[PDB]
Design a protein around this ligand. Structure first.
Ligand code: CA
Ligand code: CA
Ligand code: CA
Ligand code: CA
Ligand code: RU
Length: 316
């Protein structure tokens, strides 16, 4: 909507107060004009018609329980925007400041969040398996990263390119979580998963096997469920990424860690310059090696560590 930029205040899903960029014109709307061509957050009102209505509030205060998922979808979209711009010089998900649109209160008891090809969509969870999923910065940045991938490598969402697509989203969702630097970890979804159980999450990058996901190519899933296991075999690549950043010895193979920033540069460059829609795991290894070669040189530790990491998960 046309209006003047303002700053509202509210509480997110986890009860934390944050300021949010809004737009005033009769109502205060969740429209942030300070980032690219705008960040816009919508109310799906428990139904499934999208995007629903641009979020309107009479007084620019967003402290009602119903407001919380919107506050966090809006704010963490901005954090994700900031990460890609400041860390990778990328302006929004298309690299040309496309508007970022999000809808919350999608459906009823909906235990998921997703990028639909055009926007982000967040369920509220059923209160048991999940609380509103925009409360998880890694979930928000994971699904916004699917938009980045769709505009760059274009990894097809099935089989190994699909598991790479998923891992790329887990990798950058986690790096955005470290960027925001609030209780960061290498798990996925922990802030919004199972409020009745502490210490768990949807997936783990540092030990995928904690949830029955493979941590080596010899344990890959080859059936047809889950689009050929894209949320399962993503564990193989998540482990590789974790090892590249943090190092460790995995099934006897030692990896020298090079840290998060370099993991992020290498995988960003792979995603945007070398991966293609049909890339498989072995092709990702090559892309990552070449990216590390470009950035740090063929004889670098960075290249050697990337190779160690893919050897450790059985990917040649
Ligand atoms: Ca209000
Ligand atoms: Ca965390
Ligand atoms: Ca996390
Ligand atoms: Ca939990
Ligand atoms: Ru996903």
């Amino acid at each position: 909507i046309t209006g003047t930029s303002t700053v509202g205040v509210g509480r997110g899903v986890l009860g934390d107060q944050k300021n949010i960029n809004t737009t005033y014109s009769t109502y205060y709307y969740l429209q942030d004009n300070t980032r690219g061509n705008g960040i816009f957050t919508y109310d799906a009102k428990y139904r499934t018609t999208l995007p629903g209505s641009l979020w309107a509030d009479a007084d620019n205060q967003f402290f009602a329980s119903y407001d919380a998922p919107a506050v966090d979808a809006h704010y963490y979209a901005g954090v994700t925007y900031d990460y890609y711009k400041n860390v990778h010089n990328r302006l929004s998900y298309d690299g040309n400041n496309a508007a970022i649109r999000s809808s919350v209160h999608y459906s009823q008891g909906y235990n998921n969040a997703f990028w639909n090809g055009s926007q982000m969509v967040y369920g509220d969870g059923d209160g048991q398996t999940f609380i509103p999923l925009s409360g998880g910065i890694d979930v928000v940045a994971h699904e916004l990263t699917h938009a980045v991938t769709d505009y760059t490598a274009g990894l097809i969402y099935q089989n190994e390119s699909g598991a790479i697509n998923e891992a790329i989203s887990d990798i950058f969702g986690t790096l955005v979580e470290f960027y925001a630097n609030k209780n960061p970890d290498w798990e996925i979804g922990e802030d919004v998963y199972t409020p009745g159980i502490s210490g768990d999450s949807l997936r783990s990058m540092s030990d995928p096997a904690k949830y029955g996901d493979p941590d080596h190519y010899s344990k890959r899933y080859t059936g047809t469920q889950d689009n050929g296991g894209v949320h399962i075999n993503s564990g193989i690549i998540n482990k590789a990424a974790y090892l590249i950043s943090q190092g460790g010895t995995h099934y006897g193979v030692s990896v020298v860690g090079i840290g998060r920033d370099k993991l992020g540069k290498i995988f960003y460059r792979a995603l945007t310059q070398y991966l293609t829609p049909t890339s498989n795991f072995s092709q990702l290894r090559a892309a990552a090696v070449q990216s590390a070669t470009d950035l740090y040189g063929s004889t670098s530790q960075e290249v050697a560590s990337v190779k160690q990491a893919f050897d450790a998960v059985g990917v040649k």
